[PDB]
Design a protein around this ligand. Structure first.
Ligand SMILES: CCCCCCCCCCCCCCCC(=O)O
Ligand SMILES: CCCCCCCCCCCCCCCC(=O)O
Ligand SMILES: CCCCCCCCCCCCCCCC(=O)O
Lengths: 42, 250, 269, 238, 269, 60, 42, 269, 60, 42
C-alpha cells in the first residue's frame, strides 16, 4: 500500500509528506563574490 | 576588494569604497526562452538605447528624516527611450540594477537600510476608504515616511509598520544592503524579474518598491558640512517588449 | 529524511584566523558554528527537520466559511464568493509567501437544529442538501426553485444527513502560473478602479440549499467549509503580519507596537 | 460479495489525515509551470536569516525607531553597570519574541539547536573601544558585576574595520529539546554586556554612538511539535 | 493527449506568394496561420484540447424529470414517458448533432416532507420506494395495489431513505443504428399523422410508488432523475438553437433577433 | 472479514465522477454499427468552420 | 487500478475520458480538387 | 514462543554437594530446582509464558476520563488536562515501572439523553460532536462560539451519533527519552515550588463541544475516553501500591495493614 | 464498485482487539532511544525475585 | 494478511503480541562473582 493510486486524476492523490530538500544559500549568501569565514570579509 | 567598476551602455559608475554586490535570490537576469513564452510575435530588443544608467533626483538626509520610497518601473518613465517604448508597447520585460550613493567624512555617523520589496502593498490611513493613485506614485520626487500616525485619504507612512502592516526590523528577509558611513558609501543591488505572469503591463503594475530607512540617526558637531545628499541611480537590463500600437497618453 | 549536521571536536587555538569578525553591510548572514569560537566535543545529531517543510506546515484543515440557511424569501439559500481572506487563522499562514501553487481538498460539515417556538410538535424524515459551484460567468440562481439548480454542466454534491462529511478535490484553476496573494496594481490601465488583490481573484460562487420543499415548523442549518492545501509550492517568503486585520477586501491596518514594553534596558524577569 | 468488517474510527473527519478523494473536475489541464526565483522549501531557511532585535523595549519606544538603538557613551560615570541584559529564552522573552526566529518559533511547541547574535557599531570612524558580551548558563542568579560575567561563555569585541562580532550560544541543556512556553523545568540563561574599556573619541567628534543587534538560528536548529500562534485573534466578523 | 501546433519563426518577404488572398465561393475555409502574414518568433505550445471532446462535454449529469407523489386516488404514483425533450438545459446540448449513440447512467434523488396541517402528531418508521420500468407494449398499472407491480420480468429498484442515491446503467436500446433527434417525416405512408421526432421515440414508461401502505397523516415525496451519457459517438453537427423552446413535442418557435442592438456601426463601448 | 475504514466523502453524488455501476439489462445485444458520414469528435472542429458575422447590429 | 472491470457487461464501465482524436479536414476542406495556400485559389 | 523448561529424572544421592544450602545476605535468589532435592520423573512441559509479557499485559483498553456537557454558560463544553492519574484501575497498573515508552490508541464513546422536564415534546435531527486537542501553549477557547474552534493547525475529529466509535493513534510525544511516572524533585532550582510528578507532565488539554447551535429543550451528553498502550517498553520494576489512593496530584497515603489478621500462628482454615 | 457484504460483528468496540488506526500526528519525529538499565520484558521475572512473607499475621 | 501495513506512519500499526524474550538474570543474579549451586555459597 501507500503507493497505489485508485483514481486516474493526479489531483486525486495523497500529499507528499515525506520529502526533505533544502537550499538556504539563496537567502543567507546572496553575494556575488565568495566570502571565506576564516579570511577577513573586507 | 573595495574598488569596483560597472559599465553598461554609454555610462560607467566607479566606486572606491563598497561591498560585494548582492544578486537578487542568486539568479542573474536573462531573456525569456521559447518554452516559457506565451506570446506569438517578434519581440523588439533594444540593447544600448534602453539599457543604461538613469540618475534620479537627489534628496537631503537631515537628522530628523524618517525615510523615502520609490515605486518603479513607473518612476523610470519619460526618461530616455525606455519610457518612450513603454508608451507604444502593451507588454514588457526588464531587469534592474540599483546603485545608491551617500558620502560623508570620518567625523559623521549614521546608518541606512536599502531594501527592495517585491509586490509591496500600501494600506490607507482611513481603513474605510481608498486613496488616489497620486499618493503612491508621483514620478518626480520621493515620498516621505513619518514618525507618527497620520489621517486622511493617504497611506499610513508610519516607520513602525512601514505602510505594509509588518515589523520594520523584519524587512531584512528581502535582498538588502546597509550603508554605514564609517565603512562604506555606496550600495549596489541587482534584481531579476519576478512576476506570476511572464509579461505584464508596466503602467498599471508596480513590480517592486525601493525603501531607504535610517535606523541610526545622522549626528555631527559644529563646523562639519550639514548638507549630505543621497542619490539613486538605476539601469534597466535585458529590456524586451511585445505588442505595438498607438502611444498611450499617461 | 536526512539529519542535521554533527558537531566536530575543537581545541585551543591562537592564530590569525578570525571567524567571528565579519561585515554585516555586505548583506550576507554569517555561517559561524559553535565549534569555531569554543572548545566542543563530538556529538551525533539525529534530529530531522521533517515537520518544518511547507507541505507539512500547510497540510491541515482550516475553516474558511460559515453561514446559515433556513427551511420553513432569500434566506433559504446561501451565496459565497470563494476567497481565502475571510478567516484570520488561515489568512496569516498564507500571507507569508507572495506566489503559491496548491491543490485544495475541500470538505463540509452540515448541522441542523429546530428553532424555538410556541408549538414544536412535528415529525420529519431525514434531510438532504445540495451544493453547487457556479463557474465564473455562469448564471446565478435567484430562487430556491429556480431553473439554474439542475446542474447539466456545473458540479454538485448531494449529502444526506447522518453519513460521513463530503469531500472533494480541486486542481490548479488559476489563469496565471501561480496564485498572486499580493498585487500592487490597479484594475484599469488609466491607474483607476480598485487597488488590491481583488482584481486578480476571479473565483466563482457557491450555492447551498435544502432539497426538501417544506416543513411544518421552521428548521435552520449551518454549513462549515474546511480547506487543506496539498502538492504545494511557495515563492518569495514574506515577513509575518503584525497588526490585526480590519477588512477582508484590503490590507488596511492601524499603528501597533513592535514588542511588549519592559521596565528598563537591564531588567531581567 | 467480499465479507468485510468495519473497524472503530470509521465515518470520522480528522484534520491531519491523508486520504484519496474523488476529483470534482476530471481531466483538467493546468497551465505549464514557470521558473519563479526564490522558492522556499523549508521554514527553517527563513529562521536562519538575520533580523533586527528591539532590545530597547522600554516604555515610549515600542512605537518608534529608538527600540532598536542600544546607546553607548563616553564617560567616567556608571562604568561598572550593565549596558543591557535580557533572557536567552527565544520563545517568550519580549526582546526577541517578535523577531523572524521568534515568529516561526511560536507556530511550534518544541525547539532545539543553537542561536548566534551579531552586533553592528554605528559610530564615527575615528571612535575605538572594546566590549565584553557574556552568556551565563542557567542555574544561578543574573550576574551583577563583570567578575561574575567573565566566568561564563564570553567574547571580547575590539571595534574596528570589521565593525561586527558574533556570539554563539552552544546549546547547553539537560534534555534534547526545550519548550517554547515558559516552564521552570527547561529554561535558558541570560545575556549581558559590560565595558572592557571606555570609548575614546578625538576632539570634534560625536560623543555618543549606537549599536544594533541581529539574531539568527544555526544549522542545528529544529522544531518538532506543531501548534497555533498566540499572536493572532479575531474578535468578530471581518 | 497531444498538444496544439507550435509557432514557426518568420521574416520579411517580397514574392509572388499570396497566402492571404483566397476565394470563399469554393466552400473551403482558409488555413492561413499568423506566421504567414506577420513576423513571429518561435514558441512551444503545450495547450491541449482535452475538455473540448464530445465525451467530456456530455460527461456530466443533468436533470430530466421531476414529479410528486403522495402517501395518505391517482396521486399515489407517477407516470413518465422517457424523453429528453422536457428540460431546456440538456435539450440544447443534445440538439447540436443529428444522430448519436450513447449509454446512459441514470440516478435518482428522492426526498419526503410532511404536509402542513392542523394536527401533525405522528411517529412513522423509515420509508421505502419502488421504481419500475415498463418495456414498450407492457401492461401499465392503474392502481397502487395493482397486479402489475410484482416485477416477474420487468426491472425494479428498491431504495430505503437515508442511504446513497440509486444508480443504474442502460445500454443502446434503439431499433435503428443511432438515435435520430430530428426526423423530417410523417408517421403514415400517406403523408399524414404526426410530424416530428415523436414517431421514432418508442421508449417505455416509468412508475414510482410508495411501498408503505398508509400513514396517519399525509406525506408527499419528490423524485428527480439525472442522466449522464457515456461511450458517446456523434454525427452531423448542427447549429445551436437561437429561439427559446415553446413545446416539448415539436420544434415550434417565435421570431427572434440574431444579436443585441448596438448604437451605430462604429460604436465601441 | 477484511477490516475496512470509511473515508470522508462517502455516500455522496457528484455530477463529475466516473464510477462503475450495475447494469439494468444483463447480456443485451446491441444492433451492429454502421458507417454514418460526418463524425464529429472534438468541439473545436465546429469552431474552425467560417460563419457570417452580423456587423451591422444597429436598431431595426 | 483504473483498468480493472468488476462487471461482465460492457455498458457497466467508466467513460472514455482520455481519448484525443481529431479530423477537421471533413468540414474545413470539403473540396474535391486540392487547393494550395501559396498558389492562387483560381 | 518457546515453552518452559522440562523436568529431568533424579535418583538417590549421598555426597558433599549441597544445592539446598545457600546464603541470602549476598542478595542472590537461589536457583534450586525440584529435581535437586527430590526424586522426580521425566515430564515434557509445553506451557508458555505468552500472556505474561508487558505488551500483552498492557494491551487492553481502560477508562481515563468522564465528564458531561449540555446543549440548551461554561457548561456547554468540557476541559480535560491529559493525565493518567485519575482512574485507579489504570493508575495501579502503570505504577509498577519507573520509566515507560508507549504509543496510545485513544477511542471515545459519546451518549446523549434528554433531561426530565415538565414539557418534553420536541423533534430533533441527529447530533454531531467535535473534539479538539490544544497543543501545550496554544490558545484555550473561552466560549462555545469562540474563534479557537476553527482548527487551522490543531487536530480535530467530528463524529455523528449512530456510527462506530472514533479511534486515533498518538506517537511518543515526550521531551525526554521516556515517561517518568515518579519524579523525586522540585520544579525550581532553589528547592521550592511543587514536589511530585506534576512538573514533568506537560501534556496539552482537550475540548469537547456540540456542533448544533440550540435545541428546544435541554439535552445532556457524556463522553468516555479509553487508552490502549502499544509498542511498549518498561524499565525499573516497582513494588505494587498497597494503600488506596487519596489525591490525583500527589502520592499521599494513610497507614494500612500488610496482610489480613489470622487467629494464631498455627491456624489453618 | 467492488461488491462487499457486511458480516455480523461490525461497528463494535472490543477492548481486546488489534486493528490499524489513522495517526493523528503525521510524520512526527520521536526522540532517539537511550539505554536505560533494568528493562523488564515479562512479568514472571518479578515473581521469581524473593520477598519477605508476613507469617505472624496475628492480631496487633 | 497480518503483515501488510496500509498506513505510512509507524505508530499506525498493530501491537506486537507474538514476542517472547526473557532475561531473569538481571534481578535474580546481580552478584559480581559467580556462584555455583552445588558448591557452598561462602
Ligand atoms: C461542491 C462541489 C463542487 C465544488 C467545486 C470546488 C470549489 C471551487 C473552489 C476553487 C478554488 C480553490 C482555490 C482558490 C484559493 C484562492 O482563491 O487562492
Ligand atoms: C428503474 C430501474 C429500471 C430502469 C431502466 C432504465 C430506464 C430506461 C431508459 C432507457 C432509455 C435511455 C435512453 C433514451 C434517450 C432517448 O430517448 O434519446
Ligand atoms: C481528538 C483528536 C486529537 C487527539 C490527539 C491525541 C490526544 C493527546 C494525548 C497525548 C498524550 C498521550 C500519552 C500521555 C500519557 C502520559 O501522560 O503519560
Amino acid at each position: 500500500y501507500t503507493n497505489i493510486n485508485f483514481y486516474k486524476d493526479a489531483a486525486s492523490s495523497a500529499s507528499n509528506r515525506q520529502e526533505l530538500q533544502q537550499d538556504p544559500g539563496k537567502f543567507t549568501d546572496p553575494v556575488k563574490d565568495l566570502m571565506v569565514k576564516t579570511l577577513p570579509a573586507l | 576588494d573595495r574598488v569596483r567598476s560597472m559599465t553598461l551602455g554609454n555610462s560607467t559608475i566607479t566606486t572606491q569604497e563598497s561591498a560585494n554586490v548582492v544578486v537578487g535570490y542568486g539568479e542573474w537576469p536573462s531573456y525569456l526562452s521559447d518554452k516559457e513564452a506565451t506570446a506569438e510575435d517578434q519581440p523588439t530588443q533594444p540593447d544600448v538605447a534602453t539599457c543604461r544608467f538613469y540618475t534620479l533626483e537627489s534628496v537631503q538626509w537631515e537628522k530628523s528624516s524618517p525615510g523615502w520610497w520609490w515605486k518603479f518601473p513607473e518612476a523610470l518613465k519619460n526618461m530616455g527611450l525606455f519610457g518612450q517604448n513603454m508608451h507604444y508597447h502593451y507588454l514588457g520585460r526588464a531587469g534592474y540594477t540599483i546603485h545608491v550613493q551617500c558620502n560623508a567624512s570620518k567625523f559623521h555617523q549614521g546608518c541606512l537600510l536599502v531594501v527592495c520589496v517585491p509586490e509591496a502593498e500600501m494600506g490607507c490611513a482611513d481603513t474605510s476608504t481608498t486613496f488616489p493613485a497620486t499618493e503612491l506614485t508621483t514620478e518626480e520626487e520621493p515620498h516621505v515616511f513619518t514618525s507618527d500616525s497620520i489621517t486622511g485619504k493617504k497611506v499610513q507612512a508610519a516607520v513602525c509598520n512601514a505602510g505594509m502592516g509588518v515589523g520594520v526590523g523584519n524587512l531584512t528577509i528581502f535582498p538588502h544592503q546597509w550603508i554605514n558611513l564609517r565603512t562604506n558609501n555606496s550600495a549596489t543591488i541587482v534584481m531579476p524579474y519576478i512576476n506570476s505572469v511572464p509579461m505584464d503591463n508596466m503602467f498599471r503594475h508596480y513590480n517592486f518598491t525601493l525603501m531607504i530607512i535610517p535606523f541610526a540617526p545622522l549626528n555631527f558637531n559644529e563646523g562639519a558640512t550639514a548638507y549630505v545628499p543621497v542619490t539613486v541611480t538605476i539601469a534597466p537590463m535585458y529590456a524586451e517588449y511585445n505588442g505595438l500600437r498607438l502611444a498611450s497618453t499617461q | 529524511d536526512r539529519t542535521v549536521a554533527n558537531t566536530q571536536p575543537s581545541g585551543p587555538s591562537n592564530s590569525k584566523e578570525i571567524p567571528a569578525l565579519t561585515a554585516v553591510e555586505t548583506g550576507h548572514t554569517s555561517q559561524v558554528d559553535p565549534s569555531d569560537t569554543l572548545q566542543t566535543r563530538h556529538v551525533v545529531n539525529f534530529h530531522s527537520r521533517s515537520e518544518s517543510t511547507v507541505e507539512n506546515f500547510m497540510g491541515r484543515a482550516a475553516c474558511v466559511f460559515m453561514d446559515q440557511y433556513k427551511l420553513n424569501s432569500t434566506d433559504n439559500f446561501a451565496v459565497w464568493t470563494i476567497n481565502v481572506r475571510e478567516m484570520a487563522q488561515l489568512r496569516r499562514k498564507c500571507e507569508l509567501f507572495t506566489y503559491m501553487r496548491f491543490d485544495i481538498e475541500m470538505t463540509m460539515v452540515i448541522t441542523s437544529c429546530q428553532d424555538q417556538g410556541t408549538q414544536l410538535e412535528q415529525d420529519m424524515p431525514v434531510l438532504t442538501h445540495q451544493i453547487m459551484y457556479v463557474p465564473p460567468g455562469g448564471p446565478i440562481p435567484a430562487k430556491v426553485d429556480s431553473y439554474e439548480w439542475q446542474t447539466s454542466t456545473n458540479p454538485s454534491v448531494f449529502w444526506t444527513e447522518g453519513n460521513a462529511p463530503a469531500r472533494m478535490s480541486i486542481p490548479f484553476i488559476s489563469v496565471g502560473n501561480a496564485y498572486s496573494l499580493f498585487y500592487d496594481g490597479w484594475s484599469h490601465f488609466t491607474q483607476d478602479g480598485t487597488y488590491g488583490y481583488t482584481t486578480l481573484n476571479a473565483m466563482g460562487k457557491l450555492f447551498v440549499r435544502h432539497v426538501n420543499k417544506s416543513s411544518p415548523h421552521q428548521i435552520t442549518s449551518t454549513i462549515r467549509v474546511y480547506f487543506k492545501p496539498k502538492h504545494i509550492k511557495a515563492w518569495v517568503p514574506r515577513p509575518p503580519r503584525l497588526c490585526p486585520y480590519i477588512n477582508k477586501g484590503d490590507v488596511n491596518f492601524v499603528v501597533t507596537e513592535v514588542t511588549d514594553a519592559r521596565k528598563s534596558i537591564t531588567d531581567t524577569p | 460479495g467480499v465479507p468485510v468488517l468495519n473497524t472503530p474510527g470509521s465515518t470520522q473527519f480528522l484534520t491531519s489525515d491523508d486520504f484519496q478523494s474523488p476529483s470534482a473536475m476530471p481531466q483538467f489541464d493546468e497551465t505549464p509551470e514557470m521558473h519563479i526565483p526564490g522558492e522556499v522549501r523549508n521554514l527553517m531557511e527563513m529562521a536562519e536569516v538575520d533580523s533586527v532585535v528591539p532590545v530597547n523595549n522600554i516604555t515610549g519606544k515600542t512605537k518608534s525607531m529608538e527600540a532598536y538603538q542600544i546607546a553607548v557613551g563616553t564617560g567616567n560615570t556608571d562604568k561598572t553597570k550593565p549596558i543591557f541584559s535580557f533572557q536567552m529564552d527565544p520563545g517568550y522573552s519580549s526582546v526577541l519574541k517578535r523577531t523572524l526566529l521568534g515568529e516561526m518559533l511560536n507556530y511550534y511547541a518544541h525547539w532545539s539547536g543553537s542561536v548566534k547574535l551579531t552586533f553592528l557599531f554605528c559610530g564615527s570612524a575615528m571612535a575605538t573601544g572594546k566590549l565584553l558580551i557574556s552568556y551565563s548558563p542557567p542555574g544561578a542568579s543574573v550576574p551583577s558585576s563583570r567578575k561574575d560575567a567573565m566566568l561564563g561563555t564570553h567574547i571580547i569585541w575590539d571595534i574596528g574595520l570589521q565593525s561586527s562580532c558574533v556570539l554563539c550560544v552552544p546549546w547547553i541543556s539537560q534534555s534534547h529539546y526545550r519548550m517554547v512556553q515558559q516552564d521552570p523545568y527547561t529554561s535558558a540563561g541570560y545575556i549581558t554586556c559590560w565595558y572592557q574599556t571606555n570609548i575614546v573619541v578625538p576632539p570634534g567628534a560625536p560623543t555618543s554612538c549606537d549599536v544594533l543587534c541581529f539574531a539568527s538560528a544555526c544549522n542545528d536548529f529544529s522544531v518538532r511539535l506543531l501548534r497555533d500562534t498566540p499572536f493572532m485573534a479575531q474578535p468578530g466578523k471581518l
